[PDB]
Amino acid sequence: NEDMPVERILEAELAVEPYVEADPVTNICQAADKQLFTLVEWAKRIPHFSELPLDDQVILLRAGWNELLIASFSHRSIAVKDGILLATGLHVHRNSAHSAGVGAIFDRVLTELVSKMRDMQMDKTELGCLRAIVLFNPDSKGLSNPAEVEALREKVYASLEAYCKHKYPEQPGRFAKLLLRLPALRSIGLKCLEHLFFFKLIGDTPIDTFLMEMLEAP
Amino acid sequence: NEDMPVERILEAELAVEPYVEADPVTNICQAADKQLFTLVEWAKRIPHFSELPLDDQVILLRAGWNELLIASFSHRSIAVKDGILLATGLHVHRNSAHSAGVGAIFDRVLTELVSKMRDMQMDKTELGCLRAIVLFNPDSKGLSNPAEVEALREKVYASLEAYCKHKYPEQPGRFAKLLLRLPALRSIGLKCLEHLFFFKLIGDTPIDTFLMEMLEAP
Amino acid sequence: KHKILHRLLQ
Amino acid sequence: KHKILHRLLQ
Numbered sequence A, B: 001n002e003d004m005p006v007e008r009i010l011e012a013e014l015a016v017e018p019y020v021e022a023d024p025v026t027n028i029c030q031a032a033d034k035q036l037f038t039l040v041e042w043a044k045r046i047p048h049f050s051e052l053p054l055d056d057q058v059i060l061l062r063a064g065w066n067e068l069l070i071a072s073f074s075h076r077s078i079a080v081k082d083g084i085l086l087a088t089g090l091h092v093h094r095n096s097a098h099s100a101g102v103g104a105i106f107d108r109v110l111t112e113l114v115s116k117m118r119d120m121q122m123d124k125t126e127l128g129c130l131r132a133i134v135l136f137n138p139d140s141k142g143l144s145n146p147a148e149v150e151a152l153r154e155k156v157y158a159s160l161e162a163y164c165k166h167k168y169p170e171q172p173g174r175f176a177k178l179l180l181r182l183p184a185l186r187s188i189g190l191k192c193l194e195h196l197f198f199f200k201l202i203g204d205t206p207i208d209t210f211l212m213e214m215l216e217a218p
Numbered sequence C, D: 001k002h003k004i005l006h007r008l009l010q
């Protein structure tokens, strides 16, 4: 906990993350653009992120933003049963997502992420730590010092494990259960990106400036 | 270790897994088809897999075969520095993969999987356990009893953690380090599948019967 | 469907 | 490149 305190990761979550029914896809994309601004503020509050070279900060956020945002709105959505809660104060119902052509990815979000976060009562410290692990992705291409990012990831998951063992000692598998939602998060992030590139290609869905910038090459 | 013994998972690895330079992509696809047969024999040796309903065995293998095969040839390839070792006794050099148009996915395999398996000296018991975790994927769509598959996954990772704590007590982060290669494995599996569907579409690359069957809907 | 896989699982 | 992201990281 010493060089990567979970208390500071929780503080980062609480600092950035405080409904009416919502083309729902336009509303979803507007909320994503809004939350990219919030994501930069979140990352600056994660210990040692701001100490990396600027180029590496850019690389990590460009590599991770979609998984980072999906984890956040999925955890936010534990509070409803049949919908996703957008950061703009709008709810997207299952029926609304399906009627807009994005039912399959909606269903994956609810079945692989929201419902599983709810089932295990994943807390905000655990969410923040999983997000910090995603942020400190040492496989991100072009990093100036991948081993330094590897080291930061290791500090996060060591702190997370100690947190879980202290708060949930009756659940010895909890730490692994948390980490084992990251393959699903990766898949769902890739599928969301595929949709966004298609929306950009067809041109019938407004995409605001920061979301558009994240869809630039490379 | 009692209901999911690591000794039996290791035995499964050793039972199925015993070079000259290799269109390298045709050779790679031939080796994948060969290894799908071997994969069924491997899965039958993983404790309790054969006790699932036949329909669920089919679902788990159709959901996981590409990640399962990639993990195997990646670990096999620790023994060379600039290539992948195919199960057919053929080596595909970096230069050969790049000259055939599949350089980018080759590079991801070496940088995110082979080199990291080598760096941490991932052993065959750990490989087998990671593969068994992938096999027992409770998010696979259509399973008759997802909670039963969840339970089997939990037994594997509990056994893996106990194995790592006993054999590598000086490396407290080792268990998490193993699990945290699974997002990369998921990404690389999805990209391999994308290539295979394109090869099938263009029609200029022989694809043998079992590999072709895995590319059928759904 | 999945003719080869079913046969091999037998 | 990445004009908005760079400005916000400042």
Ligand SMILES: CCN(c1ccc(C(C)C)c(OCCOC)c1)c1ccc(C(=O)O)cn1
Pocket (backbone or CB within 6 Å): A025, A028, A029, A031, A032, A035, A065, A066, A067, A069, A070, A072, A073, A084, A085, A086, A087, A088, A097, A102, A105, A106, A109, A191, A192, A195, A196
């Ligand atoms: C990952 C970025 N993204 C986001 C962007 C586009 C889509 C399309 C596939 C519709 C999305 O699909 C989610 C499932 O829709 C059925 C989520 C969001 C959206 C909202 C918020 C938020 O409100 O916090 C954060 N990220």
Ligand SMILES: CCN(c1ccc(C(C)C)c(OCCOC)c1)c1ccc(C(=O)O)cn1
Pocket (backbone or CB within 6 Å): B025, B028, B029, B031, B032, B035, B065, B066, B067, B069, B070, B072, B073, B084, B085, B086, B087, B088, B097, B102, B105, B106, B109, B191, B192, B195, B196
């Ligand atoms: C996942 C199934 N697959 C496999 C199938 C197709 C490809 C194409 C993208 C070329 C592949 O690309 C690996 C990187 O190539 C540059 C790997 C294999 C291949 C061989 C073996 C084996 O020999 O054990 C197992 N699975």
